[PDB]
Amino acid sequence: VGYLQPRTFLLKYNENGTITDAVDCALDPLSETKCTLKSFTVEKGIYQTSNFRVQPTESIVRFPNITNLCPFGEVFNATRFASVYAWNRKRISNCVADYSVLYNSASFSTFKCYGVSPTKLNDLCFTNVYADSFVIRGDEVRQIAPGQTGKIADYNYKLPDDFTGCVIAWNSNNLDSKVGGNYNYLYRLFRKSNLKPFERDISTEIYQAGSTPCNGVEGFNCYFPLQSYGFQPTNGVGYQPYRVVVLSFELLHAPATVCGPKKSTNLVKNKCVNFNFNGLTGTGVLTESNKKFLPFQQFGRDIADTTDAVRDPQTLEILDITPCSFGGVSVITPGTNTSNQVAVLYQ
């Protein structure tokens, strides 16, 4: 019995199509020069092979000490939502983002993430998290996206072109439809100009459609800008109410406090180790650092822009990061025809 590993092999096909020989390209430096020259024969000389490489032994995770669960219950299960023109914004901090607790009670017709893959959410830590809430008509949900037009995206709620975060929407006919007609929810219909991203306009001034000023009287060509949705249990699906939550956050630049579900390990130093710091992953050797960070910074970067220092989120100490592959190697051969014996030079 033997066990397989991922390797690169150089296979040889004769003129009948059968594999008659092979070279394991990572057995020896000699095999590496065979693999590079793409031949089974090496002439006498000295060859550069590859820099000396060290593989990591351990894996470590360092997330901040967070105990509470995030408020999924007064965000996704609120009794009353806001109107889209006066939309709501809520700060979120100091909580674990374990969203599988939503599985057994909530079903979302829309869930789309920008700037991040949904399969990485469990391994990340989130900066400056906000939640926006409102209610719209079913037809208008496609407008909650970057670079959209329409009355919601022009007068009511605008997303940035460069947006990081998720948009979540679900049907709420049972909660927000009344047999007579539910007129609590409003939207803006007339506006001089389009809104800027993440801007809220709550004024109620008579809109002047043409000339002949209104003096706030609401006459001919002088309108009341806000209008009401009529939500009734027997509407088509296009006209039914939908509850919408927009989550906005930042990744891997500043200190974070949300930090999804993942168990932390011990901090091990002076060994090449795979590491995860607040969602930022890498490989290397950790050492004690003399750098002093100002309180508002979390990572340090060098000239090549790669991260070389990090504040530990538990002990608040600065650590240096070093690559663990360094140093040149050469191989001396008298010719494969003559012998298989080789010498190796470590520069």
Partner: protein
């Protein structure tokens, strides 16, 4: 020590090589010294002399 003439000794002190010697060990630049010294910054990215 070097069996050099007087003029050769004068000439050799007027050109300053970027690095003297070709053995810079891994333990020599670990932590702060890397990314500050330019030779180690080169050697951590595969560039050797």
């Amino acid at each position: 020590p070097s069996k050099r003439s007087f003029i050769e000794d004068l000439l050799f002190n007027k050109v300053t090589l970027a690095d003297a010697g070709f053995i810079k060990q891994y333990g020599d630049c670990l932590g702060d010294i890397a990314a500050r010294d330019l030779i180690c910054a080169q050697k951590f990215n595969g560039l050797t002399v």
